[PDB]
Write a protein that binds this ligand. Structure first.
Ligand SMILES: CCCCCCCCCCCCCCCCCC(=O)OC[C@H](COP(=O)([O-])OCC(O)COP(=O)([O-])OC[C@@H](COC(=O)CCCCCCCCCCCCCCCCC)OC(=O)CCCCCCCCCCCCCCCCC)OC(=O)CCCCCCCCCCCCCCCCC
Ligand SMILES: CCCCCCCCCCCCCCCCCC(=O)OC[C@H](COP(=O)([O-])OCC(O)COP(=O)([O-])OC[C@@H](COC(=O)CCCCCCCCCCCCCCCCC)OC(=O)CCCCCCCCCCCCCCCCC)OC(=O)CCCCCCCCCCCCCCCCC
Ligand SMILES: CCCCCCCCCCCCCCCCCC(=O)OC[C@H](COP(=O)([O-])OCC(O)COP(=O)([O-])OC[C@@H](COC(=O)CCCCCCCCCCCCCCCCC)OC(=O)CCCCCCCCCCCCCCCCC)OC(=O)CCCCCCCCCCCCCCCCC
Ligand SMILES: CCCCCCCCCCCCCCCCC[C@@H](O)O[C@H](CO[C@H](O)CCCCCCCCCCCCCCC)COP(=O)(O)OCC[N+](C)(C)C
Ligand SMILES: CCCCCCCC/C=C/CCCCCCCC(=O)OC[C@H](COP(=O)(O)OCCN)OC(=O)CCCCCCC/C=C/CCCCCCCC
Ligand SMILES: CCCCCCCC/C=C\CCCCCCCC(=O)OC[C@H](COP(=O)(O)OCCN)OC(=O)CCCCCCC/C=C\CCCCCCCC
Ligand SMILES: CCCCCCCC/C=C\CCCCCCCC(=O)OC[C@H](COP(=O)(O)OCCN)OC(=O)CCCCCCC/C=C\CCCCCCCC
Ligand SMILES: CCCCCCCC/C=C\CCCCCCCC(=O)OC[C@H](COP(=O)(O)OCCN)OC(=O)CCCCCCC/C=C\CCCCCCCC
Ligand SMILES: CCCCCCCCCCCCCCCCCC(=O)OC[C@H](COP(=O)(O)OCCN)OC(=O)CCCCCCCCCCCCCCCCC
Lengths: 99, 459, 603, 56, 174
């Protein structure tokens, strides 16, 4: 031997001392409460409440507003015979081309 | 963003003042609460971003990454508490402090509004990761892995710093809004070519790009479980976010300078999938799968079309979740048998059924299985690449075939077959491990249910 | 509201219901298989009702109930197309699944995971229904991959069997090539039509081109096991007999044919793709029949018969007769499911013996399975008034009367003859003669479940073809006038195959032994395709994956270029700089040289 | 006893009070950027009879 | 129904043929339709009536947000950040509205194809022309702007198109 080294320790099994162990801590009470807080907070709170919050987030992307505006524009344009989509985004009168 | 930044800086003293047996409980509970608070950033506008103040802003691209980071912190806490049972109280608190500092730096990086602050923070993320790897790694190669990771990132990113200060001197501002509104075309000159190279190469090394990726297998194999989870889930997404941010000022030079990177990305995607086909180590297989997916993201960003950006963002989120779940499963297998060899342990389906179910789900999400967000992102990228050119479909099909091949090869080798006779220390799966897998997999399916939240600003 | 949409969606939802109840005490007990069977029966009746609604007035609908997401100008929504194809295929699939589930209640009684088996069967049924009723390409792809992965999970039912694992992986590989084709078609369609739904695709693509149609053809070939991508289907017989009866032969292998049917306007618009489809179907049916006529595993023989029928369907699509293909799909589902159930009964009675060389005497040993198999083989070969008559006879007549490839027509006729031949082989080597099984006779086919399931599938093999043919509206111009010899071609070739195969089988009783011929060796070993094409490409790919990519590039040259050379140069320069002896004379002479250089070279 | 509960569980308020302080600081930063309030061309409007500012 | 506008979403008048039976056999479709109406339609109608009665007791309203027009990028001066911001926001809103217009036209096309069924190639030629025109205009507007599109890029593209048209007209007149 070249050192005064400890031998490699044996692997410790949590089920030996605590057959109904959740694998969080060696202490049974702390292990049980760690399982309880993780499950409750994570699953219940985060998953369920965040999912319903995201589901019912207000339509700030203006999808339905854009649909209503498009409906009004289509109705007005096809009622008056105008093209449904104007070929230019900006006004050629307001655009000044070089000579 | 202060309502999310300050709770992390309060996580730090809480962890350092908590009892010796309550550190994990307190950290997990309050990390979950912070994630729930950060879920409120997903309410974005369709016109512009959320400008909180002069320093921080949130966008449709920044919000999913912030939510992913905040959700990822407690999972890393669970895995770390798995593998650090015998550590001393001070060292446990130091590990939790490193994780908290990494999360804080990542949040500030994603919310930063200037390119220089973004650079400072995304370089500051190196120190906690390097310390974690080189201090709590298991094998000898952790030191070499840390050196490779550090020097690859820094050699990539220093020219980015020089180019950023040059751009500020030239134009007047590094603010993202100003450089977006006041953008001017980048003429075809050698100086512009080298500026483009500096920025793109920094973020490509961060991606990583094929040929500049060996640090990724070295670090991911040799890092502890928390380091492996954070490195693949989030730290690989800094390059993609940066490239999606800086490409505003690099046009139209990107049309001419993207060919070598596109060829590298496609061919290296094929090559890394082939490498996955012949891997004797599970963590290495997962690492090279990560490289292939990030190469696909690089292709999407380089082709740079509105359909490619949405696919890139969706694929980044999906890959983060999937790679984190795969690393967790491999870590449980390793803790069972104390070795990373793939063929050492077999029959884990007849020895551990629920873990076999988790493996099946993770491998199904790893390959593009509809209607998962993985498939959504991959399909958008494939469509954009098809519009770009019509042989990219050949390359993408080859990659998909090899991806399915190696994913199912890993699943069959680890789970199916007959159990190894001499391995009799495989105890039943823990409630902690099962909860970890469930919390990895359920958000992915919920994001599949609601997909517009991870498609970025181009949606 | 019209009850059409409500009843169709209700059938799909009640199919999905028992999956939700898989986390309950009913799933923990032994009533789950009966529960699933009852649900499938109720769904079958509830889907029979809309079939009556359609056959009266020809009502068709599309239901875009749920809007998923809008990619700018492309709207992806959950839409269901309830047309002739859907409302005719749903009740047939539900009926076959009901029969297979009762047969599995009998067959898998000793399996500890019979509940999981039934849950997997129900999931496959749900995914197949999604594929059939899908209205847009994304939903069609969802059903595609769902049935693919369910096939993967059910083929490798016994996880301890390396052959089962290899078969599952092989099926996945071939289906992934098909998926490559499918993704190509989807990408082209979206890029060039701004849509992923059939209505806009048909409206805009007045002349569909080679790239999308070839993508669709490749996907169909991969899913339906045409030539080139065929071997996965015969190898898929590693799973339990109920899986082979329900999934592959009856419902899943017709997914590619169904996909090609759903794009029949585009197929009509193009011609080169039609020629390619005709040639592919002809070569597939010929090759599979030729391999079938000399197999000794009954499941293998039935699998090759299924592949030959799929090739016949592909030929039918290629001659621009999409509706005859669908009719043949239905008839083939019926009688092939019955044949697989009879083969499974024979296998289970002889203690898991699947060799016709060990079967014999079953004509009188097992009466009911004997008569059922005889009826199924008569229907398969095209008996003049059975279920298979109303499809195969018309298909052959249309092939003879069309402007087609002469070689394709010849191969189709030869394939029909070889179909008769292998049906005769199965009957002769399984039921005629003296017993060859082990002496302990455990033969018992008196189970009510097996008897009732075979009874239900037996009435369909006789009467269903007549009803379906006489109820559907005329959707094609009949071939009223044709020469008498061309009118009787199918019967003539069928009888010739019967006679020649019967003579060749009767020659086996002689006390004469001869070494096998080269043709026999070629046909028995599946044409050597699995050997060469499963050893050479895989060996080369796995050798290049390690010698070139991993070792030569990643571990050697990518290391040598950037990180190793830099470290070597820095180490050499560091040694050169730090190698100093600490001599003031030396470095003061260096100072003098530096002073001179600074004075002279700097101005 | 009750004191030991507070002695050990007093760290559970640090994150909530940090969240409250962060919300307060967000309000403080928002109140410093009120230079174009009720002045943009798009959202310019006359004030309601019983209001002073359009937003805080 | 009054939920949508019949002009925006046209439907041709529905002509359902009258039943003319020619046999004494009872109609299973009619019998099953009567059973379905008795067992399902009446209960769902009663439930909906109860729900709508509950709704009418708490009737409240929501409005459609109105945006006024603002000066556009053509009027904005160079590097005038406020005007550029306003013009960019207005341009993005107009882009969203145009996308929804294209979506409406596509929905019309799909519905007409499904409704006509076997005679779609002839009876849907009217909706195909409108879709062709709308798609052409939308492509000319926002065809190749890229991921970082902006009102400035759209204006530059329009200027290039106008210059090309002027050059073509001059060449033709020469
Ligand atoms: C050696 C053989 C070789 O040249 O292989 C090129 C080949 C690139 O792929 P490609 O598709 O052949 O290139 C397309 C055109 O040839 C070149 O594209 P192009 O002609 O359309 O013009 C674009 C060109 C414009 O030209 C320039 O910009 C040239 C100016 C000098 C640039 C010098 C490099 C600066 C960046 C640092 C690179 C560090 C590595 O862009 C570049 O040159 C990009 C430079 C960076 C290339 C990729 C860097 C990462 C390599 C990873 C593997 C390393 C091992 O491979 C590599 O560059 C890496 C392996 C060889 C080293
Ligand atoms: C969500 C569910 C997540 C479950 C996670 C695992 C939970 C667990 O441990 O359960 C054990 C527990 C009891 O097991 P045990 O025997 O006591 O324990 C021993 C082993 O665990 C026993 O292990 P096992 O072998 O019995 O495992 C059961 C199950 C466990 O594995 C799974 O549940 C796998 C699920 C993830 C797959 C990942 C790749 C695909 C991603 C798709 C994402 C869709 C998201 C949709 C929204 C989700 C919202 C949450 O695995 C399978 O059934 C085999 C995989 C089948 C996958 C088929 C997927 C085809 C595509 C379906 C797409 C549907 C949506 C789009 C439709 C569009 C057109 C309308 O089983 C269950 O609770 C049953 C799970 C649910 C049924 C199977 C999965 C159905 C998925 C949907 C199919 C479509 C039809 C509609 C169904 C409606 C309901
Ligand atoms: C590169 C070439 C590419 C070719 C592409 C095209 C291929 C077309 C294929 C056509 C069908 C070929 C069928 C036979 C091949 C498989 C033979 C085999 O393995 O049998 C063992 C196998 C028995 O297996 P086993 O129980 O294990 O017994 C072990 C053997 O005994 C062990 O004894 P074995 O090993 O001695 O048994 C084999 C032996 C005995 O088998 C036979 O004799 C079978 C004969 C079948 C009938 C053929 C003549 C049909 C005449 C029809 C006449 C009427 C025409 C219509 C007009 C009527 C009014 C004018 O056969 C031969 O030696 C050759 C038979 C003919 C081969 C044709 C392909 C030639 C390949 C290249 C040349 C090779 C030459 C050298 C051979 C190798 C070196 C020695 O036989 C069967 O199961 C029955 C076979 C089927 C019989 C009925 C076939 C009817 C349909 C085909 C004829 C056409 C009918 C009309 C169609 C419609 C026209 C419009
Ligand atoms: C046939 C096969 C069917 C199988 C389907 C199985 C699922 C059961 C049926 C689906 C359930 C009914 C559909 C519910 C759906 O509509 O709601 C979704 C809602 O799902 C949630 O949005 C998913 C939440 C995803 C985010 C969860 C975060 C939890 C923490 C995890 C953080 C990590 C994520 C990191 C990236 C962000 C989509 O939103 P939306 O359709 O319009 O809701 C309508 C209500 N409106 C009209 C008022 C809007
Ligand atoms: C589009 C680009 C791709 C085109 C095809 C490329 C083929 C690349 C080959 C795949 C690489 C293989 C990597 C590892 C595969 C899995 C491991 C493996 O090899 O298992 C072998 C496994 C089991 O062997 P068994 O035959 O069952 O014998 C069992 C005895 N106990 O067999 C296989 O799965 C091999 C299948 C590979 C198929 C290769 C050839 C495929 C055919 C391609 C050409 C056909 C084109 C189709 C024409 C369509 C016309 C419209
Ligand atoms: C040995 C050969 C080295 C080749 C690789 C280069 C790495 C060594 C860096 C040494 C400098 C070489 C490039 C110098 C380019 C340069 O200075 O000009 C760029 C230009 C100068 O223009 P002006 O001076 O203002 O004149 C105006 C003209 N009318 O300034 C800029 O645009 C800023 C660009 C920052 C410099 C970028 C230099 C690095 C080039 C990118 C390489 C990235 C390496 C990343 C490593 C990862 C993989 C190994
Ligand atoms: C369950 C039993 C509940 C008991 C009460 C029954 C409730 C009946 C009353 C109806 C409820 C109200 C309602 O449905 O509102 C519609 C509401 C939302 O309105 P949208 O039009 O979709 O808005 C657009 C969203 N982007 O739709 C729904 O929530 C119902 C969704 C059910 C559809 C089936 C679920 C499909 C999920 C499959 C997973 C994803 C697949 C991807 C599809 C791919 C398509 C290409
Ligand atoms: C002209 C201007 C440019 C001049 C040079 C500028 C330097 C540019 C960047 C330098 C890279 C910095 C890392 C190289 C430092 C030298 C490494 C070295 O000395 O090699 C020895 C060293 C082993 O020796 P020791 O660990 O010290 O102890 C031995 C015990 N028996 O070899 C190694 O394997 C260490 C390598 C680990 C990190 C290597 C760097 C990895 C990335 C380098 C290139 C960056 C890629 C860019 C993307
Ligand atoms: C090295 C040479 C081959 C290179 C390509 C194949 C690479 C290896 C296999 C890749 C498999 C996955 C990708 C398959 C892509 C198929 C593309 C295709 O079918 O293109 C059709 C091509 C163009 O047709 P298009 O332009 O639409 O119509 C106008 C008339 N030319 O039409 C033509 O060109 C006319 C000929 C039609 C027949 C083409 C058959 C292609 C088969 C591909 C799958 C092979 C397995």
């Amino acid at each position: 031997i070249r050192l005064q080294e400890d031998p490699d320790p044996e692997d410790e099994n949590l089920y030996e001392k605590n057959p109904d162990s959740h694998g969080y801590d060696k202490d049974p009470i702390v292990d049980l409460w760690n399982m309880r807080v993780v499950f409750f907070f994570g699953f219940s709170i985060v998953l369920v409440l965040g999912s319903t919050f995201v589901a019912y987030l207000p339509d700030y992307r203006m999808q339905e507003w854009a649909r209503r505006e498009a409906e009004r524009l289509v109705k007005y344009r096809e009622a008056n015979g105008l093209p449904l989509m104007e070929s230019n985004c900006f006004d050629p009168n307001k655009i000044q081309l070089p000579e | 963003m202060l309502k999310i930044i300050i709770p992390t800086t309060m996580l730090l003293p809480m962890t350092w003042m908590s009892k010796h047996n309550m550190i994990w409980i307190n950290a997990t509970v309050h990390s979950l609460l912070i994630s729930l608070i950060s879920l409120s950033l997903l309410n974005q506008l369709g016109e512009n971003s959320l400008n909180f103040s002069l320093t921080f802003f949130s966008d449709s691209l920044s919000a999913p990454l912030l939510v992913l980071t905040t959700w990822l912190l407690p999972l890393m806490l669970m895995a770390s508490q798995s593998h650090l049972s015998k550590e001393t109280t001070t060292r446990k608190k130091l590990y939790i402090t490193m994780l908290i500092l990494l999360q804080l730096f990542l949040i500030m990086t994603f919310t930063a509004t200037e390119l220089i602050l973004f650079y400072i923070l995304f370089e500051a993320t190196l120190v906690p990761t390097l310390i974690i790897i080189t201090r709590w790694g298991n094998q000898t190669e952790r030191l070499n892995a840390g050196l490779y990771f550090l020097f690859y990132t820094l050699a990539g990113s220093l020219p980015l710093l020089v180019a950023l200060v040059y751009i500020q001197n030239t134009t007047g501002s590094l603010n993202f809004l100003i450089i977006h509104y006041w953008s001017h075309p980048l003429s075809n000159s050698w100086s512009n070519i080298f500026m483009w190279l500096a920025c793109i190469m920094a973020f490509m090394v961060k991606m990583p790009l094929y040929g500049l990726h060996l640090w990724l297998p070295k670090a991911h194999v040799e890092a502890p479980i928390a380091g492996s989870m954070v490195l693949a889930a989030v730290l690989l997404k800094l390059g993609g976010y940066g490239m999606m941010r800086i490409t505003t000022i690099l046009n139209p030079l990107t049309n001419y300078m993207a060919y070598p990177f596109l060829m590298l990305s496609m061919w290296g995607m094929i090559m890394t999938s082939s490498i996955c086909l012949r891997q004797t180590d599970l963590k290495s297989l997962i690492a090279y799968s990560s490289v292939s997916h990030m190469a696909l993201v690089i292709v999407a960003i380089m082709i740079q079309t509105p359909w490619s950006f949405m696919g890139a963002t969706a694929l980044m989120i999906a890959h983060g979740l999937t790679s984190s779940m795969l690393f967790c499963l491999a870590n449980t297998n390793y803790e069972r048998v104390h070795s990373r060899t793939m063929i050492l342990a077999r029959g884990l389906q007849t020895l551990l059924p629920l873990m076999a179910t988790w493996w099946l789900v993770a491998s199904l999400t790893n390959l593009a299985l509809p209607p998962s967000i993985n498939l959504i992102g991959e399909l958008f990228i494939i469509t954009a690449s098809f519009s770009w050119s019509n042989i990219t479909i050949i390359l993408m099909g080859m990659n998909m075939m090899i991806t399915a091949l190696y994913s199912l090869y890993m699943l069959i080798t680890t789970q199916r077959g007959k159990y190894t006779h001499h391995i009799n220390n495989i105890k039943p799966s823990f409630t902690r491990e099962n909860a970890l897998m469930a919390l990895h997999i359920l958000p992915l399916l919920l994001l599949t249910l609601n997909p517009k939240m991870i498609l970025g600003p181009l949606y | 509201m019209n009850p059409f949409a409500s009843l169709t969606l209700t059938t799909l939802t009640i199919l999905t219901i028992p999956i939700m109840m898989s986390n309950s005490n009913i799933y923990k007990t032994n009533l789950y298989p009966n529960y699933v069977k009852t649900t499938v029966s109720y769904a079958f009746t509830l889907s029979l009702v809309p079939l009556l609604m359609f056959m009266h007035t020809g009502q068709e609908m599309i239901i875009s109930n749920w809007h998923w997401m809008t990619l700018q100008t492309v709207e992806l929504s959950l839409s269901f197309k309830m047309d002739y194809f859907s409302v005719m295929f749903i009740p047939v699939a539900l009926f076959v699944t009901w029969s297979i589930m009762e047969f599995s209640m009998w067959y898998m009684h000793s399996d500890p995971f019979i509940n999981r088996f039934f849950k997997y069967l129900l999931l496959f049924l749900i995914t197949m229904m999604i594929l059939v009723t899908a209205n847009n390409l994304f939903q069609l792809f969802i059903g595609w991959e769902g049935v693919g992965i369910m096939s993967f999970l059910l083929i490798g039912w016994w996880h301890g069997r390396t052959d089962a694992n290899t078969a599952a992986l092989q099926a996945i590989l071939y289906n992934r090539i098909g998926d490559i084709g499918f993704v190509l078609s989807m990408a082209w369609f979206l890029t060039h039509s701004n849509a992923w739904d059939l209505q806009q695709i048909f409206m805009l693509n007045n002349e569909c081109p080679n790239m999308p149609l070839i993508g669709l053809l490749l996907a169909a070939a991969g899913k339906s096991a045409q030539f080139g991508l065929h071997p996965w289907l015969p190898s898929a017989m590693e799973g339990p007999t109920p899986v082979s009866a329900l999934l592959h032969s009856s419902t899943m292998v017709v997914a590619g044919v169904f996909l090609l049917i759903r794009f029949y306007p585009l197929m009509e618009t193009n011609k080169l793709v039609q020629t390619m489809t005709l040639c592919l179907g002809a070569i597939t049916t010929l090759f599979t029949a030729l391999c079938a006529i000399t197999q000794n595993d009954i499941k293998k023989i039935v699998a090759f018969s299924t592949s030959s029928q799929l090739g016949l369907m592909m030929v039918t699509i290629g001659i621009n007769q999409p509706h005859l293909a669908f009719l043949h799909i239905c008839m083939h589902a019926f009688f092939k499911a019955m044949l697989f159930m009879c083969s499974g009964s024979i296998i289970h009675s002889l203690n898991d013996e699947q060799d016709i060389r060990k079967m014999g005497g079953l004509y009188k040993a097992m009466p009911f399975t004997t008569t059922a198999l005889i009826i199924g083989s008569l229907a398969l070969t095209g008996m003049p008034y059975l279920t298979g008559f109303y499809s195969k006879d018309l298909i052959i007549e249309a092939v003879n009367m069309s402007y087609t490839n002469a070689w394709a027509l010849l191969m189709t006729l030869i394939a029909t003859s070889l179909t008769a031949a292998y049906s005769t082989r199965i009957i002769f080597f399984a039921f005629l003669g003296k017993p060859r099984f082990p002496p302990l006779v455990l033969i018992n086919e008196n189970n009510p479940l097996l008897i009732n399931s075979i009874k239900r599938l037996l009435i369909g093999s006789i009467f269903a073809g007549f009803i379906i043919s006489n109820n559907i509206p005329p959707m094609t111009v009949p071939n009223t006038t044709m020469p008498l010899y061309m009118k009787m071609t199918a019967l003539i070739v069928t009888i010739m195959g019967f006679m020649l195969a019967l003579e060749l089988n009767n020659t086996t009783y002689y006390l004469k032994f001869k070494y096998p011929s080269q043709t026999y060796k070629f046909s028995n070993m599946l044409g050597y395709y699995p050997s060469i094409m499963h050893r050479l490409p895989t060996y080369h790919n796995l050798s290049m994956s390690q010698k070139s990519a991993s070792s030569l590039l990643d571990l050697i040259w990518l290391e040598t270029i950037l990180p190793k050379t830099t470290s070597f140069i820095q180490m050499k320069m560091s040694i050169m700089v730090s190698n100093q002896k600490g001599l003031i004379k030396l470095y003061f002479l260096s100072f003098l040289i530096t002073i001179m250089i600074s004075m002279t070279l700097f101005n | 006893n009750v004191l030991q509960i507070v002695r050990d569980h007093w760290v559970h308020i640090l994150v909530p009070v940090g969240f409250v302080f962060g919300c307060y600081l967000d309000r403080r930063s928002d109140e410093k950027l009120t230079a174009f309030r009720n002045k943009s061309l798009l959202f310019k409007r006359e004030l309601r009879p019983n209001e002073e500012v359009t937003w805080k | 129904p009054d939920s949508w506008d019949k002009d925006v979403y046209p439907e041709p008048p529905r002509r359902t043929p009258a039943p003319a039976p020619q046999t004494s056999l009872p109609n299973p479709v009619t019998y099953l339709t009567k059973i379905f109406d008795l067992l399902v339609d009446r209960p769902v109608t009663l439930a909906r009536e109860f729900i709508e009665q509950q709704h009418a007791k708490n009737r409240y309203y929501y409005y459609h947000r109105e945006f006024r027009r603002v000066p556009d990028i053509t009027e904005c001066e160079e590097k005038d950040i406020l005007c550029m911001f306003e013009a960019e926001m207005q341009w993005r809103r107009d882009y969203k509205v145009d996308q929804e217009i294209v979506n409406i036209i596509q929905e019309r096309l799909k519905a007409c194809q499904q409704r006509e069924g076997e005679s779609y190639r002839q009876n849907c030629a009217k909706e195909l022309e409108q879709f062709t025109q709308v798609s052409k205009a939308f492509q000319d507007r926002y065809s190749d702007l890229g991921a970082h599109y902006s009102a400035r890029k759209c204006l530059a593209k329009q200027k290039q198109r106008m210059l090309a048209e002027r050059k073509a007209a001059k060449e033709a007149a020469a």
